[PDB]
């Protein structure tokens, strides 16, 4: 099984540079050519960087010069160099591998996250989202967890530790002064709460934060 | 140079219809000795780009045989038979055949479904963040559809204007619909010299706002 996984993301400061990893597994790493393509906040896509088995490598025009691709053949590791970094690098970075030859780029990674911006880092406040009353609830309720203030993106958010999976809504967060801020519902039976306790773990990577929230009825 | 245009930016479809996003070049794909390589890919929400078709119409291993792509020259089609939940996404075509390789602006896959109204819950500020001095008022419009939903917020029967952020999800894969969150934030304040709160949710499947609402009457 083809396997890819990014890492060295994270915040970066405009003029710097940052070194991203892909740790690939699961062929024979100088078979294939390799590629990363990033993705900018419009969804659109941007072709990077490519190196061909044969160690040739190949570079767009904005990028030429500011960023370097090569590989570790013998730790199987892709990396991408990427230097005077400016806000508009900021984007998600996925290697690839081609299918074959130059075909298509048949297996990516999941992607790791690299903004480029003069802000701090920042933790995210966590505050539950109760019931405050009861005039008329069905055999559903809907609780939540407001996650507000925190910087860089990414944030990660989950119910009971994935128990429950089912009947999530995590709403994009939304910038604002420099500070990204979202919510997350979960709606589960009316009769299994406060029966069973509902929570939410948020995590912020950027930040090395780890956070659970319990849900508590709200009283007068 | 090489430009890729894909047509149209989004595009409804129903379960069980058909589907065809369009992707123009700027030059014969006729590589240099036979095939073209015209790509097509699926990203959808949460997930990484994959592919689904490449050297114009080869179908990639795992890829439903719904999926088709095909055209020559300067015009290229993927189509999508009998369409299923799990399809939508955001399509993009991509071309690599010439320097540099690049992608379409996408394309993204709607799902007409029957229509359905949001249900609206209300949320005032919580203990702890009271304390830090601040005041959001949370208010969840989950699960409807078509798309189109506005959200007016008012204090105490006059509508706020200022301090309101929201955000709409993609499409659920799961029942065809879209959630959607207004956040009203105030310092706490200016939050304590009111004392009624609420949100109305204005929808295509009523002639009346869904209203909902707290007032710090007490409880």
């Known amino acids: 099984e083809v396997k890819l996984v990014e890492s060295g993301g994270g915040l970066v400061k405009p003029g710097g540079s940052l070194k991203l990893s892909c740790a690939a597994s699961g062929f024979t790493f100088s078979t294939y050519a390799l590629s990363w393509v990033r993705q900018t906040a419009d969804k659109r896509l941007e072709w990077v960087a490519s190196?061909?088995?044969?160690?040739?490598?190949y570079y767009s025009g904005s990028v030429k010069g500011r960023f370097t691709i090569s590989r570790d053949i013998a730790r199987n590791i892709l990396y991408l160099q990427m230097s005077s970094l400016r806000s508009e690098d900021t984007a998600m970075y996925y290697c690839?591998?081609?299918?074959?030859?130059?075909?298509?780029?048949?297996?990516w990674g999941q992607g790791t996250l690299v903004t480029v911006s003069a802000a701090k880092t920042t933790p995210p406040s966590v505050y539950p989202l109760a019931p405050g009353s009861a005039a008329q609830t069905n055999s559903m309720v809907t609780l939540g967890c407001l996650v507000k203030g925190y910087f860089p993106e990414p944030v990660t958010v989950t119910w009971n530790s994935g128990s429950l999976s089912s009947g999530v809504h995590t709403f994009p967060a939304v910038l604002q002064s420099d500070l990204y801020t979202l919510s997350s519902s979960v709606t589960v039976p009316s009769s299994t709460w406060p029966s069973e306790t509902v929570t939410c773990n948020v995590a912020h990577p950027a930040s090395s934060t780890k956070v659970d929230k319990k849900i508590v009825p709200r009283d007068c | 140079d090489v430009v890729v245009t894909q047509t149209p930016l989004s595009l409804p479809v129903s379960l069980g219809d058909q589907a065809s996003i369009s992707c123009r070049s700027s030059?014969?794909?006729?590589?240099?000795?036979?095939?073209?390589?015209l790509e097509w890919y699926l990203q959808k929400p949460g997930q990484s780009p994959k592919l689904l078709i490449y050297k114009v119409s080869n179908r990639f291993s795992g890829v439903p045989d719904r999926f088709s792509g095909s055209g020559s020259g300067t015009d290229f089609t993927l189509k999508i038979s009998r369409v299923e939940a799990e399809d939508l996404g955001v399509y993009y075509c991509f071309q690599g055949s010439h320097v540099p390789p690049t992608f379409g602006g996408g394309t993204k896959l709607e799902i007409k479904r029957a229509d359905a109204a949001p249900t609206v819950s209300i949320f005032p500020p919580s203990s702890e963040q009271l304390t830090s001095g601040g005041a959001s008022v949370v208010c969840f419009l989950n699960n409807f559809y078509p798309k189109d939903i506005n959200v007016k917020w008012k204090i105490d029967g006059s509508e706020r204007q200022n301090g309101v952020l929201n955000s709409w999800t993609d499409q659920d894969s799961k029942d065809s619909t879209y959630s959607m969150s207004s956040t009203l934030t105030l310092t706490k304040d200016e939050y304590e010299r009111h004392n009624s709160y609420t949100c109305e949710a204005t929808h295509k499947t009523s002639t009346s706002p869904i209203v909902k609402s707290f007032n710090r009457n007490e409880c």
């Open positions: 030059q014969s794909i006729v590589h240099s000795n036979g095939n073209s390589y």
């Open positions: 190196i061909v088995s044969g160690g040739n490598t």
């Open positions: 690839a591998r081609e299918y074959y030859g130059y075909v298509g780029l048949a297996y």
